[PDB]
Structures are given as structure tokens and as C-alpha cells.
Write a protein that binds this ligand. Structure first.
Ligand SMILES: CC(C)C(=O)Nc1cccc(C#N)c1
Length: 460
């Protein structure tokens, strides 16, 4: 049985509004309703992995697992294996996989982050799962962020707290947060960003929704505007939204948006909004294609509609050669030329680089670079030709060209990372000097750039 080079992943996010689900929710897992929907001809075809995020979930883990497993069984005639389930308050993530994948899945991690302090430490935060699927690392984050049209800053703060403190993936990757630890990272949930238009425009917004004219609404979506100003979800992707706002509905119909301020809303308006979202961030030059992104029309127990997204995602095999794993393959090397980091830091201290990759027996520390002043005030850290020669465990190009090198630039004085980034080895050529580039972030904020040239030696 050959190892896959591609899998399909279903991502679901549903804020259940503290109500049990209806007897049939199969439309969700089939990507049927509004938006970018899945072809009817695929309905019997199971996804390889199903990742379900709920918010305001009133069910026990046992109650929800029974509904999810029985649902997928009715659709596919396959009995899914439970990879992981983690719940923080009423925020839950379930990962299910086809039985044929049981022995391809390992290194399963779960974690949660509680957001807010005293007042605001109450019910918001994130849960997450990570695991290895053969040679591919996969991360999944379900977050319920701060509610309310006037709290987009709080939501952006909740995001930064979750990405700093959610402990998933390989703990040996100590300089890197979740936004660098995974081949493919999926981040979804009730992110609670709103359509930022005047209250008096509520009926105009509803009219626009009824005509399926989303352009003037999405131009005021707080997640799109905050992302365009690099305030949140830097370097993440989202498929185009072509479905109606998923919040806030009257329960038991989809014919009506409930937007007016009530005691129950803290006297806040809930203008129709895309609260419920799926974003992803994959390593450079890895295959990832969104094949669906939409909302169900027929599940009406909550004041939110479930959202689905499906993805084709590139995966690699667990490679074994005569040499690595367990030693280096002297037929392989990675060299770096004319390299320099440009940093936004106003500080003047020495820096060195760390290289981390599963293609190396362990991480590699460089010599300190030489600091120079950029023409526009920047700190430029010059490595020139001084960066070490990296020694991969496997030289076969079918392995090495599918790998990535994570880079951290660290203070000599503190050993603290000032910026992290990622370089693909999927080069246009081997044994050839080629430009490389990565932005550098710290706590998911842009802190600089790394550029230079690479020269990759493989066994071919
Ligand atoms: C007890 C549960 C959470 C568990 O360990 N699940 C698991 C582990 C390894 C592979 C797969 C699959 N498929 C599932």
C-alpha cells in the first residue's frame, strides 16, 4: 500500500449557542449550503482527517463524539478513529481520521490558552491539536475570541496570546511559536470579528445579504481590514467569502437576523457578521488548495450557522535511507551566501542565527553576524559567507527538496529570538546559487527580514 502524497482535510467551526444540535447535521460534513460548496459527486468520498471546532458547546465529549462518529458513518460507511479531543470550558476540538491512517499518525499534542485577566478571564480562549501525519506536521487551533463590535483590538490581543502560549508541535523547536512549527496550520473558530458599519444601517445590511451582494459588507469586515493593516493573522490565508454572514440568526429559522440590542446582549447591537472563520498558514511551496468554504442553510439550533472548509494538503512519507536517519549523508549539503538579516529593533547587541529542521540531526548555531546601519535607520546583520554548511541526514533529492529550514535570529546577550522565519528547499535548481527570502516575525509581529542565496547539494 503506497504512502499518500496528498490528503483532504475537513475543518468545521460551529458556535452551538449552548443548545443541543438537531438530529441531522450531515450537510456540514458534506460542505452543502452557501458559498464555495463541494460537488455532489464527492458526497460518499471520506475526507482523510475531520477537525471539528465548537464554541458554546453544551454537550459532554461523549455526547458529541457519538453524534460526530455516527454522522460520518451514515455519510461514508466508514467508522472514524478518534485522534484527539480537548475541551476548555465550552470550546472544543475533535480530530477524527480514517482507520487506514491509524499508524501514520503519531506525536499527538493537545493544549488550551485562556485569554483575558480577572474580568476577561472567564470563557474565551483556544484549544488545539497537533500531530505528525507520516513526514508532515499538522496543527489545528479552535479559538472563541472576545465578542462585541467595539473589541477588535481585544480579539487581536487574544490571537497574540493564543499564538505565544499554545504549546503544540515539537518542543525542540524552542524559538518558534505555533505559526512556524507545522507544515500546515489551520486556525478557525468564532473569531468574533464584525461588519463595522453604523447601527442605523442594519436593515440596509440585511437587504444586501438577501441580494447576495457581499462586496460592500466584506469591505467593512474587521478580520479582513485588521489583516490588511497587519494587526492580526499576518502571513495567514483565507478563501474568498461567498456565503451570507453566519451571525446573528433567530433560532429555528435562517429567514431572520436578530441584530437589535437586548438585555441578553448587554444592550449591544449584533449587526450581521462573519464571526465564524477558517484560515491557514502552510510552509512555503507546499501544496495546499481550499476546495470548499461555506456555511450550512439547514442547521438552525444556534444563532450561528456552522462553517465548513476543505483542503487538499501535500504530505510526505517517513523517509529511510542506508545513512539517515541515525547519521548524516555526506552526498548532501546546504550552503548560504551573501546572507543578511534586516531587523526593526532599535537595540544595538550582537546576533547569531539558529537553523532548525527535521533534515538535520540537531539545530545549528551560526557565528555572530556583523551589525551595520541601513540607509533608512535599519539594523542590518551581515553574515556574508560566514554561515555554516548544513549537513542533512538524507541526500536523496526526493526527500531533501520537500524539506524546510526554520531560522531564528537570536541576541548573543540574552539568547532570546528577535525573529523567526522559514526557507523552502523546493528550489528551481541544485548546485546553483539561488535567491532565498523569508519575513521574520516574533510573537507573530513583523520584526525584520532574512535574505541571501542558497546552494543545495543532493545525491542527483
Ligand atoms: C486515546 C486517543 C485520544 C488516541 O490515542 N487516539 C489515536 C492515537 C494514535 C493514532 C490514532 C489514529 N487514527 C488515534
Amino acid at each position: 500500500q503506497p504512502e499518500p502524497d496528498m490528503i483532504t482535510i475537513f475543518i468545521g467551526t460551529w458556535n452551538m449557542g449552548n443548545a443541543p444540535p438537531p438530529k441531522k447535521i450531515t450537510s456540514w460534513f458534506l460542505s452543502k449550503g452557501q458559498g464555495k460548496t463541494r460537488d455532489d459527486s464527492a458526497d460518499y468520498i471520506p475526507h482523510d482527517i475531520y477537525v471539528i471546532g465548537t464554541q458554546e458547546d453544551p454537550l459532554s465529549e461523549k455526547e458529541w463524539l457519538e453524534i460526530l462518529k455516527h454522522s460520518l458513518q451514515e455519510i461514508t460507511s466508514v467508522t472514524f478513529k478518534t485522534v484527539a479531543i480537548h475541551t476548555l470550558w465550552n470550546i472544543r476540538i475533535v480530530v477524527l481520521a480514517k482507520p487506514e491512517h491509524e499508524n501514520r499518525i503519531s506525536h499527538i499534542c493537545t493544549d488550551n490558552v485562556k485569554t483575558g485577566i480577572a474580568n476577561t478571564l472567564g470563557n474565551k480562549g483556544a484549544v488545539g491539536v497537533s500531530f505528525m501525519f507520516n513526514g508532515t506536521s499538522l496543527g489545528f487551533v479552535n479559538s472563541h475570541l472576545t465578542s462585541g463590535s467595539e473589541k477588535k483590538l481585544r480579539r487581536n490581543q487574544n490571537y497574540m496570546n493564543i499564538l505565544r502560549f499554545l504549546a503544540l508541535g515539537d518542543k525542540k523547536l524552542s524559538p518558534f511559536n505555533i505559526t512556524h512549527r507545522f507544515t500546515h496550520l489551520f486556525w478557525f473558530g468564532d473569531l468574533n470579528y464584525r461588519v463595522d458599519l453604523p447601527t442605523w444601517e442594519a436593515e440596509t445590511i440585511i437587504q444586501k445579504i438577501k441580494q447576495q451582494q457581499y462586496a460592500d459588507l466584506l469591505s467593512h469586515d474587521q478580520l479582513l481590514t485588521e489583516r490588511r493593516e497587519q494587526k492580526v493573522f499576518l502571513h495567514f490565508e483565507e478563501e474568498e467569502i461567498t456565503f451570507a454572514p453566519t451571525y446573528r440568526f433567530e433560532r429555528l429559522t435562517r429567514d431572520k437576523y436578530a441584530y437589535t440590542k437586548q438585555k441578553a446582549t448587554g444592550m449591544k447591537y449584533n449587526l450581521p457578521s462573519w464571526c465564524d472563520r477558517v484560515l491557514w498558514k502552510s510552509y512555503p511551496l507546499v501544496h495546499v488548495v481550499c476546495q470548499s468554504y461555506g456555511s450550512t442553510s439547514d442547521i438552525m439550533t444556534s444563532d450561528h450557522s456552522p462553517v465548513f472548509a476543505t483542503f487538499e494538503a501535500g504530505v510526505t512519507s517517513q523517509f529511510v535511507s542506508k545513512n539517515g536517519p541515525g547519521t548524516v549523508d555526506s552526498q548532501g549539503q546546504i550552503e548560504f551566501l551573501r546572507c543578511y538579516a534586516t531587523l526593526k529593533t532599535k537595540s544595538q547587541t550582537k546576533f547569531y542565527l539558529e537553523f532548525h529542521s527535521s533534515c538535520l540531526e540537531s539545530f545549528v548555531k551560526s557565528q555572530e553576524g556583523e551589525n551595520e546601519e541601513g540607509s533608512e535607520g535599519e539594523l542590518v546583520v551581515k553574515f556574508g559567507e560566514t554561515l555554516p554548511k548544513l549537513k542533512p541526514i538524507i541526500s536523496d533529492p526526493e526527500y531533501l527538496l520537500d524539506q524546510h529550514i526554520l531560522i531564528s535570529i537570536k541576541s548573543s546577550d540574552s539568547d532570546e529570538s528577535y525573529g523567526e522565519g522559514c526557507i523552502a528547499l523546493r528550489l528551481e535548481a541544485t548546485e546553483t546559487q539561488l535567491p532565498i527570502y523569508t519575513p521574520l516575525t516574533h510573537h507573530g509581529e513583523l520584526t525584520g527580514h532574512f535574505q541571501g542565496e542558497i546552494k543545495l547539494q543532493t545525491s542527483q
